[PDB]
């Protein structure tokens, strides 16, 4: 709803919480969302979102990750 | 489309790739998707997805994370 800040997101900006417990939790919740993004309709809406969001200068420090998502590059590096 | 597996997903199942480089990359791509999920429409579709997916026995070892997503719990644990 209008005017709310996403406290859960703001937590992820603070290196204090970048612990081994939370990195594992995020990795697994990411795998969960990845399967949602395969759903008909959602993939196309996600890409539309990415095309707008890459212009948003609030995402400073995320340039490589955005480029990768925007271009359909692997989620992780397999070496 | 039919019969393809998500090779990117399958990589994430192998502990060989659970490196500090990839954990950081995943954390940031997760933050990117989190803002997408705030978009009108998407939030409701995600929850509908979760309600089906929790019965999918293929997600063994993910029980706590699913429960948390299904019930709107914090993405990460902030102690305090």
Nearest CA-CA partner of B32 in A15, A21, A33 = A33
**For chain A, after which residues does the C atom lie more than 2.5 Å from the next written residue's N, i.e. where is it broken?**
none
Nearest CA-CA partner of A46 in B32, B2, B9, B69 = B32
Burial (0-12, 13-18, 19+ Cβ within 10 Å), A58: exposed
The answer to whether position B25 is within a domain reads yes
Nearest-Cα residue of chain B relative to residue A64: B25
The answer to whether position A26 is within a domain reads yes
The answer to whether position A3 is within a domain reads no
- Chain A contact for B60 (CB, 8 A cutoff): no
The answer to whether position A7 is within a domain reads no
Contacts of A3 (CB under 8 A, 6+ apart): none
| Planar angle of CA B25, A59, A61, nearest 5 degrees | 55
The answer to whether position B38 is within a domain reads yes
- Residues of chain B in contact with residue A22, where contact means CB-CB under 8 angstroms, are 76-77
Q: How many domains in chain B?
A: 1
Contacts of B45 (CB under 8 A, 6+ apart): A36, A39, A41, A42
Whether A79 contacts B17, CB under 8 Å: yes
Nearest-Cα residue of chain A relative to residue B21: A77
**Domain assignment of residue B38, given as a range:** 16-70
Nearest CA-CA partner of B39 in A45, A30, A65 = A45
Containing H/E element for A7?
Answer: helix A7-12
Scanning A22-51 for CB atoms below 8 A from B yields: 22-23, 25-39, 41-42, 45-46, 49-50
């Amino acid at each position: 709803d209008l005017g709310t800040e996403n406290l859960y997101f703001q937590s992820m900006t603070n290196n204090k919480y970048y612990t081994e417990e939370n990195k594992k939790k995020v990795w697994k919740k990411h795998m969960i969302v990845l399967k949602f993004l395969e759903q008909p309709g959602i993939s196309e809406a996600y890409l539309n979102y990415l095309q707008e969001e890459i212009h948003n200068d609030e995402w400073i420090g995320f340039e490589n990750e955005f480029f990768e998502e925007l271009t359909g590059k692997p989620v992780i590096n397999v070496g």
